[PDB]
Amino acid sequence: HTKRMQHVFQVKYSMDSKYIISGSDDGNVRLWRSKAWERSNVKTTREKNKLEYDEKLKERFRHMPEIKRISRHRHVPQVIKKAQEIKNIELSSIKRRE
Amino acid sequence: PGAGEANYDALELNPFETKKQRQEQEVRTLLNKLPADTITLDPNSIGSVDK
Amino acid sequence: ETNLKKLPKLETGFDALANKKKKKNVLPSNDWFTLPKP
Amino acid sequence: PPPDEEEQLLAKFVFGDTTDLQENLAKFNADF
Amino acid sequence: SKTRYYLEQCIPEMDDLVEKGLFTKNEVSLIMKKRTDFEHRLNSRGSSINDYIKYINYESNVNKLRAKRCKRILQVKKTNSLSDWSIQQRIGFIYQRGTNKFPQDLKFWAMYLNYMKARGNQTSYKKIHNIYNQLLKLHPTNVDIWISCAKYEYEVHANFKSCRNIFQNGLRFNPDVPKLWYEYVKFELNFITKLINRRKVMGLINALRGDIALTIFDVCMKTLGKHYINKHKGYYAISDSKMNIELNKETLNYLFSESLRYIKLFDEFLDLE
Amino acid sequence: SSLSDQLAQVASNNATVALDRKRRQKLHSASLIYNSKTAATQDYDFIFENASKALEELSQIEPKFAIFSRTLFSESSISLDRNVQTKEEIKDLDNAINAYLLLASSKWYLAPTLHATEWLVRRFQIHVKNTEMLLLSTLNYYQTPVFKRILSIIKLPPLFNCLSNFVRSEKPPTALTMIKLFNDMDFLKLYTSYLDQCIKHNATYTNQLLFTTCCFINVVAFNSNNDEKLNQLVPILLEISAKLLASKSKDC
Amino acid sequence: MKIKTIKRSADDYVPVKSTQESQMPRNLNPELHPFERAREYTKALNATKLERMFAKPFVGQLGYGHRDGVYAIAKNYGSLNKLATGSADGVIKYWNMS
Amino acid sequence: FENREQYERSLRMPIGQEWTSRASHQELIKPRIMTKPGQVIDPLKAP
Amino acid sequence: PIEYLLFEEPTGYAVFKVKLQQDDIGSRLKEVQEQINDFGAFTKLIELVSFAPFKGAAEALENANDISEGLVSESLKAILDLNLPKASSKKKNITLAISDKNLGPSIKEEFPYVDCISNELAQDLIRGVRLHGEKLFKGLQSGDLERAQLGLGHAYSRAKVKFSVQ
Amino acid sequence: ENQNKFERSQTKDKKLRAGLKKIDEQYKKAVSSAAATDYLLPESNGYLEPENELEKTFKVQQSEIKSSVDVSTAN
RNA sequence: GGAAACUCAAAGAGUGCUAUCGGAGUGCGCGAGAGCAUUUCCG
């Protein structure tokens, strides 16, 4: 998300499978890294070993509660957070009536 | 004759240190400081489900 | 047969580079832009 | 079967056998 | 590290080398610590081809000792296990790594080529073609490369089409040495003499004149003249009448000094028209 | 007593071992030919092979070195370590180095002898632990760059302690400080034991005999007006005048 | 009587020259590597914290954008860095994203 | 992992180089989708 | 698809196999375009696979004149005929990252199975090999580049001016 | 032969059966290829053996063991 | 107060240094293998 994009209407992966091309309604065609932390330079072999090793560690331990509550949260914008919160309480209410 | 381990493992203990690798082991172990709660009777017991 | 074995073949130096030898012994052991100090 | 002569020469090369050097030194060292 | 990776890859040969009783644990740990030090010296920061050479010497001598203890202890030649081809596989890896990390020393290139020509009975001429083609790519100028493995392709496999192909490729690559032209004429005459001897063997059991050698002689003469002139007069075409005429006399002298050498080591060849 | 003293004892007892890379380069950059920046990259086989060439030149000018090319300059001697063996073997290798040094004390005007003995300086650490045989075997060439190099490489044993203001100083030491070194009799007994070991091995030659004679006459000249010191100094010079007269060469 | 004692020997551990790399001798014993699970857990937690530190996804715009918001984006399929964007006031553009 | 026995048997073995060998460590880490670094990924069309 | 690169140098012609590829989409980023500057990552990206030096001085001047007008010559055509593989029509045709669009059609005319390319990827890859210079060539030469290029520059300038040396 | 030192101490879903076979196979392979490292372990341990019956192992003192021990360890 | 740095320690910057079953045959793929795999010569 960004403050300067409104109403994203067309998103496409690139053929490199690392870069998503998003196009807003403001006029811009922004780009994003899919993996928001993997950089794009060719890395040395010990660095690639370190990255794949600790990524495999995160994948193996993703159910632990404190690294789940660190890996999960974002800065979701306040509009989306409040509206998803009221949608969640509506869905819980309709599940109770069901 | 038999009362010493012969073959140390150089990633943790090292009787042939330098200043550079001594400071490197300092910064790595300070980065991998295990938190104080994680010492039970059996330290293989931090991966399970909670009873 | 002795004609074919008295014919000259090609002449390289490659295997001589593979198996030559050596013998040597080793013997023992301001600027343009600065101005003169007054 | 015993160790062959050339086989034990290769053994002195490969294993880094200095027992011949120690025996030769401690045997001969004082002379003339 | 990667030295740990190479050392850990060389463990199953010592595993079956102790599993069959021809090497006990003490001396196999001795050769493994010696190979550990040799391999760290190989993968240091700024190693040397002398280190590659003596590590290769260590592996060839432990292979000779392994064959000797195999013919002494087990009294069989080939143990049909991992223990036989492993040392030659490692020597192939070390020669490939040395030719990657140090490509300007023809002594080491030639030691690799002689080792592979010796082990052609176990690993055939495709590896010879591969490492010789990458040697030709990394050193096109040095004519002894073309001459050496043209001699190989003519005296070990005798494939005349590929022999003439690589002579013509090298002669295109540097048509300003006399030696490559002259030894191409020598190979061409060797081929025509072997063909006429095949015809005489046909007549024994009961067209193709030297025009090949004469055409390549003519192109030798004009091309070596032109490139000797361009070896002189370095950057600027020298423009005065007597100097141009005297350098034409100089290149006539050098060109005829080559042609008389042609006559000499053709009169040694003759057996023909 | 002093724990600092009991630790300096084990420091001088384990100076000939490398326990980190800084002490290894400090114990390896001590070399007789090259300087620090080149000698700190010399693998052992390099200096061994040029020293084997040096020993072969020295052998084909002097016929008593094929025994050393068999024993101590062997191919396995580049992997023989000094302080991993037993003390009987270290004593045997100790008098092997002593035999080599007082054999090749008369050849130090030659680049083959220098490059030959550089190998066991570099490998067998005779620039630290077999120090005094090196010093008072090459003491006679005291006006020489090879002796200035030896004195800059080595650390000084406590007998030679009046040379210590000539380390890292490009003036070679003087005749007067050589006489001040020969003056005190507890150096003089050691030098005479060296001299009669050299006599009984029969390697006495006309340079070090000249140097020993000039040092003894200047020591006697220094104690010319010291009756007590001369009375104490007679049974050293006279006793080895005797066991120098028991030799055969006209020089000695 | 036969005795022996381990020999460090100071040559196969610290180097002979200066420039070559010192040995890292190795013993894979779970005796000498005591805390397996807690140490790889803390490496996973540092992995999650460092992923949040390097969570920088945005890479760029392209051009000054279109006039009035895009409504169609077409990646190509042979080549990688070519991407067409069509936008509202009848304007199609063919970007080289390199 | 549907119960505690399969979950414990999953995480029973560590992967860092302090507890496993070099070749087994470089096998235990690699992504499930090892992609080529800088060129087009085509849809598969094999049979 | 950049897998072979051609560089021209005042001692000889070089041809480099491209081992792995550059990031095409992010090729304006700081963390990519500093990798061209540093050396420890460029030799991860480009290795030397052929270097044929023209040895005649006048033949060097002639190669420089034929490149400077954008035309193939004997040594260039020779090393491309040697190094460039015949990519058979089942797979593809081979690609070659050359430095200029004036040279492009004159190698496409002579070799059909090659396909020249100079986008900004070939531009900054050739820029990287020009920056690192001698340290790529790992000793396959006898003579540095700057004195040779001084002589070649003076000769090319006089051959363009046709300066009367009388 | 050494795997006790390196050891670390029926379903319905088919993909989970295959995943369990993969993870315990990877466990067995990593334990074996970790146990095959002590071939590459740098040196062997030390021992004093009786080698007789009268030569007991505790009628040996510092004088004889320091005599027949290395110089570096004796120092 | 000047500092010999050659006693050693803790640190800070600048510079340079590396890569990721065996030959054929045999059913074989478009002068041709980069592989699928053996009872065929086998080793």
Swiss-Prot record, chain C:
SS bond partners: none
| Subcellular location as annotated | Nucleus, Nucleolus
What's the superkingdom here? Eukaryota
The free-text function statement in the UniProt record for this protein reads: Essential protein involved in pre-rRNA processing and 40S ribosomal subunit assembly. Required for the early cleavage steps of 35S rRNA at the A(0), A(1), and A(2) sites.
What does the annotation say about its assembly with partners?
Interacts with FAF1.
Regarding protein family, the annotation reads: Belongs to the FCF2 family.
Protein's name according to its UniProt entry: rRNA-processing protein FCF2
Q: What range of the intact protein is shown?
A: 56 to 109 of 217
Curated annotation (Swiss-Prot), chain D:
From the Swiss-Prot or TrEMBL record, state where the protein is found: Nucleus, Nucleolus
The record describes the protein's role as: Involved in nucleolar processing of pre-18S ribosomal RNA and ribosome assembly.
Q: Remarks, anything else?
A: Present with 9570 molecules/cell in log phase SD medium.
Report the sequence similarity comment from the record: Belongs to the WD repeat UTP18 family.
| Subunit description | Interacts with snoRNA U3. Interacts with MPP10, UTP21 and UTP25. Component of the ribosomal small subunit (SSU) processome composed of at least 40 protein subunits and snoRNA U3.
Query: By what name is this protein known?
Result: U3 small nucleolar RNA-associated protein 18
UniProt source species: Saccharomyces cerevisiae (strain ATCC 204508 / S288c) (Baker's yeast)
Q: Which gene encodes it?
A: UTP18
Identify the segment of the full-length protein shown.
Answer: 13 to 44 of 594
Swiss-Prot record, chain H:
- The record lists its disulfide bonds as none
Q: Where in the cell is it found?
A: Nucleus, Nucleolus
Q: How does it assemble?
A: Interacts with snoRNA U3. Interacts with MPP10. Component of the ribosomal small subunit (SSU) processome composed of at least 40 protein subunits and snoRNA U3.
- What other remark does the UniProt record contain for this protein? Present with 1470 molecules/cell in log phase SD medium.
Name the job this protein performs.
Involved in nucleolar processing of pre-18S ribosomal RNA.
Q: Which family does it belong to?
A: Belongs to the UTP14 family.
The protein's name: U3 small nucleolar RNA-associated protein 14
Instruction: Specify the species.
Output: Saccharomyces cerevisiae (strain ATCC 204508 / S288c) (Baker's yeast)
Identify the coding gene.
Answer: UTP14
Part of the whole protein covered: 851 to 897 of 899
UniProtKB/Swiss-Prot annotation, chain J:
What organism is this sequence from?
Saccharomyces cerevisiae (strain ATCC 204508 / S288c)
The misc remark on file is:
Present with 5800 molecules/cell in log phase SD medium.
Q: What assembly does the database describe for this protein?
A: Interacts with snoRNA U3. Interacts with MPP10. Component of the ribosomal small subunit (SSU) processome composed of at least 40 protein subunits and snoRNA U3.
Q: Where in the cell is it found?
A: Nucleus, Nucleolus
Q: Which part of the entire protein is covered? A: 16 to 101 of 554
Positions with biased composition (Basic and acidic residues)? 1-8
Which gene holds the coding sequence for this protein? UTP7
Cystine residue pairs? none
Task of the protein: Involved in nucleolar processing of pre-18S ribosomal RNA.
Q: What is this protein called?
A: U3 small nucleolar RNA-associated protein 7
